[PDB]
Design a protein around this ligand. Structure first.
Ligand code: MG
Ligand code: ZN
Lengths: 44, 25, 155, 40, 80, 179, 168, 38, 146, 138
RNA sequence: CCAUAGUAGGCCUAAAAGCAGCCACCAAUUAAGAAAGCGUUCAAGCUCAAAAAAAUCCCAAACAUAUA
């Protein structure tokens, strides 16, 4: 299970690093959306 | 006229210790 | 329209739903007003036009249902308020068991504000800064006028 | 108005009537012709 | 308050009023409280029968009814 | 060490300096002319620093430190003259307009002259609409034509500066609605 | 007299004020208002990766899984959801749920077209590779309130009344 | 009721109305949130 | 406020006890104390400030615990940690929750260790409450006068 | 009702007393149930569990697998977690053995790891592990 | 438009389980934040994703609609 063993470690991939059309790219996008939405919510 | 039922954490209201800087007129 | 009646058996019936006149004068008019070439051509007086846009009890129908132009929708509700206050809608009174007490009658028209809502003008200002009493609506500014003198909205 | 109604820091405001605008347009379009005839 | 039975036909013409009424009454928050009451859905114009213990049969045709109108009428009958 | 006679001419007229976006998307555009005190700057630094983290977003002082003296019955303090159009404070980084506008316009509210927090896009937008409005006009008569031609003998009433001012400036005040 | 620059708005000479009145901006108004006129059709939309990805999965789940069993989302509690999920995991049948609005476009132009009336409101799909219809109906009988709207088994479209007799 | 020139929200429960020709803010959870236009 | 979960009654609670001679004796209830408490473990010993003014102490001990005799030892140790004279200050030891059979079982060893002087009580059933009231009054008349 | 017990396998039920007894419970029954699954499993391990309690006074204990958090430092020979909670190296856990233990974790539907990619499981574990100030080598 | 869960994220605490504080903020599915605001001792339960005030008594009367 060499290929299965092969896995990314350390930092998660940013939008710049990441290739779009990826499933988890859109997960990250919505994460970021709700993050900055929550960040602006505190002010009001 | 009725007294409001109190929460267990009423230490929020009740204070036993306070540092006060008093200044005269 | 849908009606609900109690006998128990309750159900909805499409009893009677009216339809729009077959030949619109200006097709491609997005508004129902813009369609019939009425844009700046009615005020509070024109109750027949306004009767088509209101619920039986006197309240007004929403934009999505009535299909109204956004800018136009504000005009009708303003005209209808004035229409009510003038007393041109006696069959669209508010909905009971209790009887309303005898109240003074004062004939009014072109009434901008709710009549229990305006504080009396005790001290009016100087000539150069006088406090004036509103008449009619600003939304009705752009209506067709047949006189040189524009609509005086403040008295 | 404390002092004179026309002069000083504080004074009773004036406003341009529709007639006073109309009058001024009449004068401006007269000198518009004047410009033309002194052009050639 | 005793029994409720609902008939709706997705095979035939589809009306969502009774259909939406299902998930309103299939909630735990209502089912746990009304443990005495029993709910059954049937799939084959839609029919709602409420069999009260008070000797009342609430019969409702959910064709020309509003989603929430269904609930309001039911509420008025059960609460009394 | 020199005292200056109060030359109010500095506040008059459009800003020709620091009217360019520099390594920043968001800035506060001055809509009027006034003198900034040190107190203003104190508030500026405090509010901006406490609002957004400097690691992700950066703020730039686009206005010089106060140096115009004020004489009071002898010189007491220093002020900064600003004409209408100067970007007072620049802001840049990986950020959005919607989330910055809030504190930015709030900070601009306290300013002695009228001002607006604007992006690059929004600033350029309003420049475009103004210059569209002037060619779009349905009035034959502009202040420009009359003033320059000396049409009604209007120069008797007008100032020499008015010809340059296009009638858009009146004292320390800038009128954007004026064409 | 006063200075040319003031802290307050200076009062103008009347002549100058008359000038300001005359040289005001006039906006052009068209004979026919542009908002009331029919709009040009909107420029064609850009297909987002979201709907493209979703496109792939729904196409895949329909093509690969021979049977699709449509049942109304009954909003069952997590406590009661687990047992159903575990029962189906033992029977190697998995659950699929999608928004109705994004489900519509496919069902417009596919092998399955007649399920568009079925797919109104909240709905989930029982998908497998084996036609264990008996197991599906068996676990359905457990909860009376929960209905089955039908769907298709072995690429043949049918409702509940057909599915019950097919189970044998 | 607190007199405020500009009216704000302090809650989700908090709601605006126009009564007697002025804006008000009413609040059932926290009646301290009440505001009156001046 | 009374509940099964520990660390209740955070605020000190005063109730007075009426008597026939038109005199009132005030009794204070403070939150639970723990062995240590000098390292601010638990709720600490901050609430102990009231007890300085209190003329005498009520050592309330639960019999649910296997060794209730060690309870008073821990209490006297922690009071000493706060203030030296508090340990030497006069008191009464009161046992609670005796309606439970395990308390009745451990009662014998309580008599062995603590002695007869300790008064045994139930709060829920109000068992032997009267002896408490006698003891409260007697301690008052002893060293709360002059 | 949902009830969670995070107690070592070789340990009995007093704090759980009020927590579970707020609805009135035979605590002895729960203790017996918990201690029954201690003997068959390897000794010296905590057993975080997810018990279910129905209103008809019935127990539905789900033993499943202990928390991943423990399993990060379990085979290391240390019994203390990350105080710093990141930005540090406290666990010198070998990546090879980390892979091995990650593989031997996902065998239960209690954790609801129904994903056929074991690679997806391990990267989720890495996401868990980054919370702790640990490191993986070789 | 909306569901579960690695997970009471961990540490400090007598317990802080999303919400005492601090650090990390990744990550399963296809389908929301190691949670933006409520609520619990802790849990459980909820939601969200456009200004003006003073002193004898307000101060023309009035009016929106007949073609410069
Ligand atoms: Mg939201
Ligand atoms: Zn509120």
């Amino acid at each position: 299970p060499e290929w299965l063993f092969e896995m990314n470690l350390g930092p998660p991939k940013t939008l710049e690093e990441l290739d779009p059309e990826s499933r988890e790219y859109w997960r990250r996008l919505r994460k970021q959306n709700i993050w900055r939405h929550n960040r602006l919510s505190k002010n009001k | 006229g009725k007294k409001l039922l109190s929460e267990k954490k009423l230490k929020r209201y009740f204070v036993d210790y306070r540092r006060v800087l008093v200044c005269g007129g | 329209f849908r009606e609900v009646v109690e006998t128990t058996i309750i159900e909805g019936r499409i009893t009677a739903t009216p339809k729009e006149s077959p030949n619109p004068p200006n097709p491609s008019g997005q508004c129902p007003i813009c369609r019939w070439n009425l844009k700046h051509k009615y005020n509070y007086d024109d109750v027949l036009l306004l009767s088509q846009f209101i619920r039986p009890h006197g309240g007004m129908l929403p934009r999505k249902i009535t299909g109204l132009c956004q800018e136009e929708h504000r005009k009708i509700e303003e005209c209808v308020k004035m229409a009510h206050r003038a007393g041109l809608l006696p069959n669209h009174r508010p909905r009971e068991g209790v009887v309303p007490k005898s109240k003074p009658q004062l004939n009014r028209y072109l009434t901008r504000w709710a009549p229990g809502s305006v504080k009396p003008i005790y001290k009016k200002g100087p000539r150069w800064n006088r406090v004036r009493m509103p008449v009619g609506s600003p939304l009705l500014r752009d209506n067709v006028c047949y006189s040189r003198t524009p609509w005086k909205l403040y008295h | 108005i404390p002092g004179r109604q026309w002069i000083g820091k504080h004074r009773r405001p004036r406003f341009v009537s529709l007639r006073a605008k109309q009058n001024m347009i009449r004068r401006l379009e007269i000198e518009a012709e004047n410009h033309y005839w002194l052009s050639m | 308050v005793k029994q409720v039975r609902v008939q709706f036909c997705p095979f035939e013409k589809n009306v969502e009023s009774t259909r939406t009424f299902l998930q309103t009454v299939s909630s735990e928050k209502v089912r746990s409280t009304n443990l005495n009451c029993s709910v059954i859905a049937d799939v084959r114009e839609p029919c709602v029968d409420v069999l009260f213990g008070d000797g009342h049969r609430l019969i409702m045709r959910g064709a020309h009814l509003t989603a929430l109108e269904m609930l309001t009428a039911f509420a008025s009958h059960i609460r009394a | 060490v020199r005292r200056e006679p109060k030359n109010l001419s500095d506040i008059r007229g459009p800003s020709t300096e620091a009217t360019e976006f520099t390594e920043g998307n968001f800035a506060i555009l001055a809509l009027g002319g006034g003198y900034l005190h040190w107190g203003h700057f104190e508030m500026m630094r405090l509010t901006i620093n406490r609002s957004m983290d400097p690691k992700n977003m950066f703020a730039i002082w686009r206005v010089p430190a106060p140096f115009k003296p004020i004489t009071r019955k002898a010189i007491d303090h220093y002020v900064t003259p600003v004409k209408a159009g100067r970007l007072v404070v620049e802001m840049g980084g990986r950020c959005e307009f919607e989330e910055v506008q809030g504190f930015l316009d709030q900070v601009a509210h306290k300013l002695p002259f009228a001002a607006k927090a604007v992006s690059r896009g929004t600033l350029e937008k309003m420049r475009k609409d103004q210059e569209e409005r002037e060619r779009n006009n349905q009035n034959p008569w502009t202040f420009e034509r009359i003033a320059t031609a000396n049409m009604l003998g209007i120069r008797k009433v007008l100032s020499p500066y008015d010809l340059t001012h296009k009638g858009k400036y009146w004292g320390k005040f800038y009128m954007p609605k004026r064409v | 007299g006063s200075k040319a620059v003031t802290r307050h708005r200076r009062v103008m000479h009347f002549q100058r004020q008359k000038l300001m009145a005359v040289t005001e901006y006039i906006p052009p108004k068209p004979a026919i208002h542009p908002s009331c006129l029919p709009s040009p059709p909107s420029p064609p939309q850009e297909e987002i990766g979201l709907i493209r990805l979703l496109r792939r999965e729904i196409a895949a789940v329909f093509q690969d899984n021979r049977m699709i069993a449509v049942c109304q989302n009954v909003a069952l509690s997590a406590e009661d959801k687990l047992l159903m999920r575990h029962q189906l995991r033992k029977h190697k049948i998995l659950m699929k749920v999608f928004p109705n609005q994004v489900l519509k476009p496919f069902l417009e132009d596919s092998k399955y077209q007649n399920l568009l009336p079925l797919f109104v409101g909240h709905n989930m799909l029982l998908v497998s590779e084996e036609p264990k219809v008996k197991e599906m109906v068996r676990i359905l009988r457990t909860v009376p309130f929960l209905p089955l709207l039908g769907g298709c088994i072995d690429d043949t479209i049918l409702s509940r009344q057909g599915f019950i007799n097919y189970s044998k | 009721f607190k007199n405020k020139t500009v009216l704000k929200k302090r809650c989700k429960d908090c709601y605006l109305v126009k009564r007697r020709g002025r804006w008000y803010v009413y609040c059932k959870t926290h009646p301290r949130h009440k505001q009156r236009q001046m | 406020a009374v509940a099964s979960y520990p660390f209740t009654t955070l605020k000190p609670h005063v109730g007075i006890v009426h008597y026939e001679g038109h005199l009132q004796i005030a009794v204070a209830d403070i939150p639970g104390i723990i062995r240590g408490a000098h390292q601010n473990r638990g709720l600490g010993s901050a609430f102990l400030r009231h007890i300085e003014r209190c003329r005498f102490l009520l050592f309330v001990v639960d019999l649910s615990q296997p060794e209730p005799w060690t309870q008073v030892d821990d209490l006297k140790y922690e009071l000493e940690m706060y203030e030296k004279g508090l340990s030497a200050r006069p008191h009464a030891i009161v046992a609670n929750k005796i309606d439970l059979p395990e308390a009745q079982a451990n009662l014998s060893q309580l008599r062995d260790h603590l002695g007869q002087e300790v008064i045994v009580l139930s709060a829920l059933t109000g068992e032997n409450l009267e002896q408490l009231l006698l003891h409260l009054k007697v301690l008052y008349d002893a060293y709360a006068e002059a | 009702g949902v009830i969670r017990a995070i107690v070592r396998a070789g340990l009995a039920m007093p704090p759980l007393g009020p927590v579970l007894g707020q609805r009135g419970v035979s605590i002895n029954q729960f203790c017996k149930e918990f201690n029954e699954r201690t003997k068959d499993i390897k000794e010296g391990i905590p057993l975080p569990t997810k018990i279910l309690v129905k209103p008809d006074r019935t127990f539905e204990i789900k033993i499943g697998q202990p928390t991943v958090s423990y399993f990060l430092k379990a085979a290391a020979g240390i019994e203390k977690g990350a105080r710093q909670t990141g930005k540090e190296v406290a666990g010198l856990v070998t990546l090879k053995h980390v892979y091995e233990i990650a593989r031997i974790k996902a065998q239960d539907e209690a954790f609801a790891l129904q994903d056929v990619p074991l690679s997806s499981v391990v990267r989720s574990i890495i996401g868990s592990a980054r919370s702790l100030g640990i490191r993986v080598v070789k």
